[PDB]
Ligand binder design. Structure first.
Ligand SMILES: [Mg+2]
Ligand SMILES: [Mg+2]
Ligand SMILES: [Mg+2]
Ligand SMILES: [Mg+2]
Ligand SMILES: [Mg+2]
Ligand SMILES: [Mg+2]
Ligand SMILES: [Mg+2]
Ligand SMILES: [Mg+2]
Ligand SMILES: [Mg+2]
Ligand SMILES: [Mg+2]
Ligand SMILES: [Mg+2]
Ligand SMILES: [Mg+2]
Ligand SMILES: [Mg+2]
Ligand SMILES: [Mg+2]
Ligand SMILES: [Mg+2]
Ligand SMILES: [Mg+2]
Ligand SMILES: [Mg+2]
Ligand SMILES: [Mg+2]
Ligand SMILES: [Mg+2]
Ligand SMILES: [Mg+2]
Ligand SMILES: [Mg+2]
Ligand SMILES: [Mg+2]
Ligand SMILES: [Mg+2]
Ligand SMILES: [Mg+2]
Ligand SMILES: [Mg+2]
Ligand SMILES: [Mg+2]
Ligand SMILES: [Mg+2]
Ligand SMILES: [Mg+2]
Ligand SMILES: [Mg+2]
Ligand SMILES: [Mg+2]
Ligand SMILES: [Mg+2]
Ligand SMILES: [Mg+2]
Ligand SMILES: [Mg+2]
Ligand SMILES: [Mg+2]
Ligand SMILES: [Zn+2]
Lengths: 410, 38, 117, 134
RNA sequence: GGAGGUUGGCUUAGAAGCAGCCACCCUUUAAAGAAAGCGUAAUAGCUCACUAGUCGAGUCGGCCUGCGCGGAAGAUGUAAC
RNA sequence: UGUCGGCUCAUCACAUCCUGGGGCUGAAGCCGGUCCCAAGGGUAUGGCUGUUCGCCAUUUAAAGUGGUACGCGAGCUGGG
């Protein structure tokens, strides 16, 4: 946006678009406003290796305004001209080949996919194989809702027939018969199952050195200041036996999109005072990629240098045993902060240090004050058991936090 | 502002002033050092 | 803090150089970093020169042996006496270079048989 | 900048850090000055190096002198210093060597003569643990 | 102005006045602490300690003691000369 | 000189529960914590129990703390 441009989610976009080397066209959008100077964007983005095609040039800079409408035709010209410099070879006669954009189920017609055809042609009738699934295109819908008999080389269509709903990254390929399709499908899930176990052991920070290779890392800090401090510290490391270069780095929890970035770039997850979400956890489990949470700044860099020289492994330091989700708070005026909670992982016990985290970023760090159920002072609460908790010399524990409890392994 | 029965300087920019027959401490550095009464 | 006895010690000390100097000049140091003056003092020490800063009121009483006695009327502001007991002159080409280079002090006057200029 | 390099160590850029604290200068030219160190006694002796980048970007090498803490350490045996000076005195120091390092430390030391420089170094020695002796 | 040996020695990945321990010396000087405080991941940076000039007659704190000021909010109506 | 609780009817204090005006905050915002000023007006319905109290269910901007023969039987009740 012309007003207030370049913010810590635009840098994430530039990193994601650099991991896969692709051309970038910048379209400053909200020029129909008083405070809409673009030159501060022009040079603010320039310190991202996105220098404009007026000083040096690897990217254009065209101002549009979506709501009003001006400038669009220049943007279309710019994007087509950028495309012209790159490749773009396709044969509109070969058997079709493409990718699937999005799939959905429906009681009528069953499963539906939104294949984008990339090469060849997809006239209605072929034997399509898409990842694990296979079938015949018994019907086809175009973008605007009208049935079509043929599909171009780069025209998105929406087919019917597959035996299951496909994923959002698989390849549509035309084949000869269903038997070959079944053989290839069986082989495909065999290989896909086989890749995961190799990745979930060879991808650890412990074994990067063993088997350049430019060690890649993805970092999610808690406050920006620590983020630039740590990026600056990690800048100079790695000379001739592996090298380090961050491919991510933003403020917030470990979003699933960041896990996907690391998975595609074969990186490793560093989390500074942050926790991973449900989706990020599920992707970590699926792809078996490494992910380690750190408490202090220097342990991150000491592990990075140790693993760069590859001299030690192991886990130690901290192990989490029990996470309780705070349900409601009834802080009594007798100098208390009694917060009700229900344990969602493990077991919580008294003589441990606790860690109060809200929106996946830790806010406190200290021990407890009371962990009674009604008045029992159980000093140990099994999972699935509601209780009341109290943190020592701390308040402002809102409704929706979590109370992690961990052991500092010695 | 902190109201106490015994007010006194807490640093080297606190000043003692009597204002309308009330002893006050005002701080030019840290607003947390404001006191009344005493 | 200097006292009545402590203060008058330097007055006698300044007299000893005054009672043996030949040509001396008065200089100021308003703005001169100690680093620049450190080399100049050692260069003055190497070249057999004697420069010191004294109170503007102590100088007017220190000079009693007729060394730079005419400089009483100009002993205002920062002031450093550059005494040269040997080779009258000598400690003049340094100030001419320093003043033109460091933009420091008007060099006040000189002490050549009571010739201030 | 007032960092110290050790008789040629510019090959790495671990301690370069010429982004947060110093301007970005092509470290190769300073690495091209790593031979300008030329050691003198092994590639482990540190040296005082000051870079002039305040005006423009013409990086200049000062190479003032060597610290009179390694010298009193190296040139008197033990390569360490007493963690409790005057309580675990590592060992006495020969006088003329203190003059010898004072003689070589002609730059700086801001003294009228070496007769005051000898007394200057002993203060440094009195913290290392060396027993000053004439 | 407020500086040199000097990032004092040690520990430490890095401890440079200012994590911690041990000392706490010397030199050009008007004076400047191997440093009182804020900051740096460590550097850098900003003040105090002290000193020169400036204006020109008083100024700083402690002790004994007479009289006062806060500490001081209640129930039918001033309502503790 | 008729002693608990309930009902009807009240009146005052402020050591303020809500609404009102502010200082500090380990106060980004929305919500908070603590202290100062302020008594104009407001300030639940039920299940259990003889209960005041209490624990529960669902509300409310909030469901204040106390004095008045622990206000009120020549105003009612009579469960204890
Ligand atoms: Mg009080
Ligand atoms: Mg008033
Ligand atoms: Mg009195
Ligand atoms: Mg009184
Ligand atoms: Mg009244
Ligand atoms: Mg009633
Ligand atoms: Mg009424
Ligand atoms: Mg009354
Ligand atoms: Mg009040
Ligand atoms: Mg209130
Ligand atoms: Mg209020
Ligand atoms: Mg308020
Ligand atoms: Mg408030
Ligand atoms: Mg009221
Ligand atoms: Mg009232
Ligand atoms: Mg009321
Ligand atoms: Mg009223
Ligand atoms: Mg009233
Ligand atoms: Mg009115
Ligand atoms: Mg009711
Ligand atoms: Mg009720
Ligand atoms: Mg009943
Ligand atoms: Mg009463
Ligand atoms: Mg009573
Ligand atoms: Mg009562
Ligand atoms: Mg009664
Ligand atoms: Mg009552
Ligand atoms: Mg009755
Ligand atoms: Mg009754
Ligand atoms: Mg009766
Ligand atoms: Mg009666
Ligand atoms: Mg009756
Ligand atoms: Mg009865
Ligand atoms: Mg009956
Ligand atoms: Zn104060």
């Amino acid at each position: 946006a012309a007003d207030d441009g370049v913010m810590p989610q635009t840098q994430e976009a530039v990193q994601h678009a650099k991991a896969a080397g692709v051309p970038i066209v910048v379209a400053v959008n909200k020029i129909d406003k008083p405070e809409a100077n673009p030159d501060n964007i022009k040079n603010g983005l320039a310190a991202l290796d996105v220098i404009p095609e007026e000083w040096g040039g690897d990217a254009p800079f065209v101002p549009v305004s979506a709501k009003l409408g001006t400038g669009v035709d220049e943007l279309l010209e710019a994007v087509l001209l950028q495309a012209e410099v790159l490749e773009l070879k396709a044969t509109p006669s070969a058997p079709g080949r493409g990718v699937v954009v999005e799939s959905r189920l429906d009681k009528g017609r069953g499963p539906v996919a939104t294949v984008l055809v990339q090469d060849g042609t997809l006239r209605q009738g072929d034997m399509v194989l898409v990842g694990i699934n296979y079938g015949r295109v018994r019907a086809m819908l175009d973008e605007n809702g009208k049935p079509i008999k043929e599909a171009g080389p780069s025209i998105p269509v929406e087919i019917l027939g597959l035996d299951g709903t496909p994923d959002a990254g698989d390849e549509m390929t035309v084949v000869a018969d269903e038997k070959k399709a079944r053989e290839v499908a069986l082989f495909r899930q065999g290989k896909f199952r086989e890749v995961k176990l190799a990745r979930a052991h060879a991808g650890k920070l412990e074994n990067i050195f063993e088997n350049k290779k430019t060690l890649n890392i993805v970092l999610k800090a808690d406050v920006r200041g620590s983020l630039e401090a740590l990026q600056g510290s990690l800048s100079g490391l790695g000379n001739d036996e592996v090298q380090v270069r961050v491919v991510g780095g933003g403020v917030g929890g470990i979003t699933e999109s960041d896990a996907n970035l690391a998975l595609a770039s074969n990186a490793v997850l560093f989390g500074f005072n942050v926790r991973a979400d449900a989706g990020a956890r599920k992707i970590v489990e699926a792809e078996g990629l490494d992910m380690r949470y750190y408490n202090v700044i220097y342990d991150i860099i000491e592990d990075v240098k140790k693993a760069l020289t590859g001299m030690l492994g192991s886990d130690l330091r901290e192990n989490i045993l029990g996470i309780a989700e705070v349900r409601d708070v009834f802080r009594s005026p007798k100098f208390g902060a009694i917060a009700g909670c229900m344990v969602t992982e493990g077991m919580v016990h008294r003589n441990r240090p606790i860690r109060v985290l809200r929106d996946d970023v830790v806010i406190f760090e200290g021990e407890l004050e009371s962990l009674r159920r009604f008045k029992d002072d159980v000093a140990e609460v099994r999972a699935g058991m509601e209780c009341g908790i109290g943190v020592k010399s701390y308040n402002d524990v809102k409704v929706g936090d979590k109370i992690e409890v961990f052991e500092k392994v010695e | 502002m902190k109201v106490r029965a015994s007010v006194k300087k807490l640093c080297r920019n606190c000043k003692i002033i009597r204002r309308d027959g009330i002893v006050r401490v005002i701080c030019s550095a840290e607003p947390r050092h404001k006191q009344r009464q005493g | 803090a200097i006292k009545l006895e402590d203060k008058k010690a330097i007055v006698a000390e300044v007299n000893e150089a005054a009672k043996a100097a030949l040509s001396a000049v008065v200089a100021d140091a308003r703005g001169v970093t100690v680093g620049a003056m450190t080399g100049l003092r050692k260069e003055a020490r190497e070249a057999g020169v004697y420069v010191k800063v004294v109170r503007n009121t102590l100088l007017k009483r220190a000079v009693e042996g007729t060394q730079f006695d005419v400089l009483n009327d100009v002993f205002k502001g920062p002031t450093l006496i550059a005494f040269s007991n040997e080779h009258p002159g000598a400690a003049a080409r340094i100030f001419r270079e320093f003043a033109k280079g460091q933009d420091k002090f008007e060099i006040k006057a000189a002490a050549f048989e009571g010739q201030f200029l | 900048i007032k960092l110290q390099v050790k008789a040629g160590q510019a090959n790495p850029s671990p301690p370069v850090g010429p982004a947060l604290g110093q301007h970005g200068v092509n470290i190769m030219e300073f690495c091209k000055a790593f031979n300008a160190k030329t050691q003198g006694q092994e590639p482990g002796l540190p040296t005082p190096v000051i870079i002039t980048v305040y005006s423009d970007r013409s990086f200049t090498f000062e190479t003032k002198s060597t610290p009179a803490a390694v010298l009193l350490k190296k040139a008197a045996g033990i390569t360490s210093g007493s963690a409790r000076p005057n309580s675990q005195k590592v060992g006495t120091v020969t006088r003329a060597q203190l003059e010898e390092i004072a003689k070589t430390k002609q730059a700086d030391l801001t003294a009228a003569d070496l007769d005051a420089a000898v007394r200057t170094i002993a203060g440094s020695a009195r913290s290392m643990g060396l027993n000053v002796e004439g």
